[PDB]
Design a protein around this ligand. Structure first.
Ligand SMILES: CN1[C@@H]2C[C@@H](OC(=O)[C@H](CO)c3ccccc3)C[C@H]1[C@@H]1O[C@@H]12
Ligand SMILES: [Fe+2]
Ligand SMILES: [Sr+2]
Ligand SMILES: [Sr+2]
Length: 325
């Protein structure tokens, strides 16, 4: 492969990462309190779990994966229409909600073996959807329905989390969940998987992420890496760095990466929900005491975002400047 994609030695993936047998798989059609308790335990101990019987239509999950795969099968001439000034966009602020193709990497500078389609999804209006891909013809109809359903499920999970923490229901149903970025990630086959990464190890910087996958490649850091079993009808829930801060580290964030495959391509669909760039992030005051003093000072989400997107020297580089006590 091109030297551009060669990861530094220490960041390269080992060839035989074991299945995470202890990744919680949570049935949302259990009794209400059982769901609250199992979600709370997974958030406290792991920061990554799967949800099944989650109420989002399996047909809609299949139709969305279909139209996302159809998008990445489009010819160059169509994909150029989402490359500002002839090039993929960068994950840097301002992060606009109009649809673009994105390149990603670390600055021993290297690129991730990944093409990403990203756009905002909330609130859904004519202007936003008109900024989405024109092809395939059904993308806008399908992804509009998908985005509304994934948000519905994410807000249910956040309210289970509220009940587990002892926060009032709807605590996150405000500026803290105003941004909904849908990242469709395309990992083409890689001739040298031993040297490349689909994505380096990271927390998602936002509040919470729901991830739809049907093929292997997602791994979690627990410093042992484990493989997250693809369940095509499930969502992987990744707790974000923002939720780690707001819970005053009562909850773990998900540190995850994606490895490349030499033979087959992979598409994943990540719905990243989190604060507006104008938000102030701090540990929830309702949970603080002399026994539980704040571990972070209040900070600008915009200021955090700039560091999070640029500085990859450590997983929590984004929040290091705001650590106290
Ligand atoms: C692999 N990268 C990581 C970093 C990057 O994430 C983002 O762009 C999110 C989008 O809301 C973001 C969160 C907080 C602040 C700013 C930006 C793109 C992908 C994704 O998995 C994360
Ligand atoms: Fe991620
Ligand atoms: Sr180009
Ligand atoms: Sr347009």
């Amino acid at each position: 492969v091109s030297e551009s994609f060669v990861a530094p030695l220490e960041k390269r993936a080992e060839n035989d990462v074991p299945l995470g047998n202890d990744v919680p798989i949570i049935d949302l059609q259990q009794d209400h309190l059982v769901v609250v308790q199992q979600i709370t335990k997974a958030c406290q101990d792991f920061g990554l779990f799967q949800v099944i019987n989650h109420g989002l239509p399996e047909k809609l999950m299949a139709e969305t994966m279909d139209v996302c795969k159809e998008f990445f099968a489009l010819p160059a001439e169509e994909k150029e229409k989402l490359q500002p000034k002839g090039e993929p966009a960068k994950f840097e602020l301002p992060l606009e909600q109009k649809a673009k193709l994105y390149v990603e990497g670390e600055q021993e500078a290297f690129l991730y073996w990944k093409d990403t389609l990203a756009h905002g999804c909330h609130p859904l209006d004519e202007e936003l959807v008109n900024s989405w891909p024109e092809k395939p013809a059904t993308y806008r109809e399908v992804v509009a329905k998908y985005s509304v359903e994934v948000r519905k499920l994410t807000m249910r999970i956040l309210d289970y989390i509220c009940e587990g923490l002892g926060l009032k229901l709807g605590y996150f149903d405000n500026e803290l969940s105003q941004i909904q970025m849908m990242l469709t990630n395309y990992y083409p086959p890689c001739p040298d998987p031993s040297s490349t990464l689909g994505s380096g190890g990271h927390y998602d910087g936002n509040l919470i992420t729901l991830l739809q996958q049907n093929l292997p490649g997602l791994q979690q850091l627990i410093a042992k890496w484990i493989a997250v079993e693809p369940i095509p009808t499930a969502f992987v829930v990744n707790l974000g760095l923002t939720l780690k801060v707001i819970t005053n580290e009562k909850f773990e964030g998900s540190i995850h990466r994606v490895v490349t495959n030499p033979t087959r391509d992979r598409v994943s669909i990540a719905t990243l929900i989190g604060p507006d760039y104008s938000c102030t992030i701090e540990p929830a005051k309702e949970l603080l005491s002399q026994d539980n003093p704040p571990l972070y000072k209040p900070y600008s989400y915009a200021e955090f975002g700039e560091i999070y997107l640029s500085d990859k020297s450590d997983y929590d580089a984004g929040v290091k400047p705001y650590k106290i006590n």
